[model samples]
Target: MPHAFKPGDLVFAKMKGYPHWPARIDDIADGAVKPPPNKYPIFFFGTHETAFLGPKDLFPYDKSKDKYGKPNKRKGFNEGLWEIQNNPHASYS
Candidate 1:
């Protein structure tokens, strides 16, 4: 299935046997328009920039739960975005 992710959306992605980390969808690969053998290109940045070529690599980030409902106790930069996104007093430009 094709994901609903779009550019600028905060999402989570992971390699097999690894934990999903918070990543922003910078863009998708060209010519990846359909499913069933069409893999969505997911571009993201961790400590540095990288890209994932499979649809399974990308997932939507849920503020209420850990990435993909798995356990994530460590606090990171995404926590800051979470605070800002949920904070009623927060303002952005």
Candidate 2:
């Protein structure tokens, strides 16, 4: 089962075509009542994406039991946050 992260914890996330970057936890979302096609156990933080795209596009990382090491495409939920592979988009540099 996946565990929830506390604020200020360091996590690794993959960005589009970018290597896994260090992400700092800022807030956690109570996804108990998600919208259509959305799921719970999500992470809401102030990442690089947030600074660039605003709150509407803030990324969410699923921390549900079934989400451990699961592929991004297979997970449910949309809107604000999304999860990427642990080591996805490895840099070529």
Candidate 3:
């Protein structure tokens, strides 16, 4: 089963005890170019510097909401402030 995902694509993955987070497909496991049917052996880098390897059932983020499914806001405490603490590359070139 060949994967439809490649490096640089944004995806969503849920870690234990955590909500779905936006992540990037940094790479895939060996021999996973055509991974086993119905399986996903892909590796990813989450916005929080988290790493994961799991199944293809991972969802694609539609940017409709935040990790917790709450409306994304940029006001008050939710303002551009959060990015500074959450995204290390927020100020990247």
Candidate 4:
């Protein structure tokens, strides 16, 4: 099934100090989207700038809120994104 987040999707992420603007999804991987095996319980951030699709916890109100309980986005940058939506065509004014 198609997940709420997919490859190439732009997302607004929350971070310390200031939240990250729209970030592009380099890739999406498969897994239980859980913890333990997965260090980051949402998306895998190689560091702070990189977010790799890995085992992530589901949220209550989130679209992909699977069996897992509500995911903590503020806890970790990989926890979840602020919001995900289609990126309209860019323009120059």
Model 3: per-residue lDDT, tens digit, 4-91?
7655445555667545544445545376455455444333232334354454446654442345334233122233224333552342
The digit string of per-residue lDDT tens for model 1 on 1-93 reads 644666666566676654576555554348754433444434333233455445466666655234344434545435534532464133221
Q: In terms of lDDT, which candidate is strongest?
A: 1
Highest TM-score scorer: 1
Poorest 10 consecutive residues by lDDT, candidate 2: 74-83
Going through the candidates in order, what is the number of backbone clashes in each? 0, 3, 0, 2
TM-score of 4: 0.30
Q: Rank the candidates by lDDT, best first.
A: 1, 3, 4, 2
Over the full model, what C-alpha lDDT does candidate 2 score relative to the true structure?
Answer: 0.32
Between prediction 2 and prediction 4, the one with superior TM-score is: 4
CA deviation > 4 Å runs, candidate 2: 28-93
lDDT computed for candidate 3: 0.44
Error of 3 at 40 (Å): 7.9
Which candidate order results from sorting by TM-score in descending order?
1, 3, 4, 2
Candidate 3 ranges with C-alpha deviation above 4 Å: 1-3, 27-47, 63-93
Assess every candidate by TM-score: 0.45, 0.28, 0.42, 0.30
Of 1 and 3, the candidate ranking higher by TM-score = 1
* Model 3 residue pairs with clashes: none
Candidate 4 deviation (Cα RMSD): 10.5
Reference-based lDDT, residue 72, model 1: 48
lDDT of 3 at 34: 53
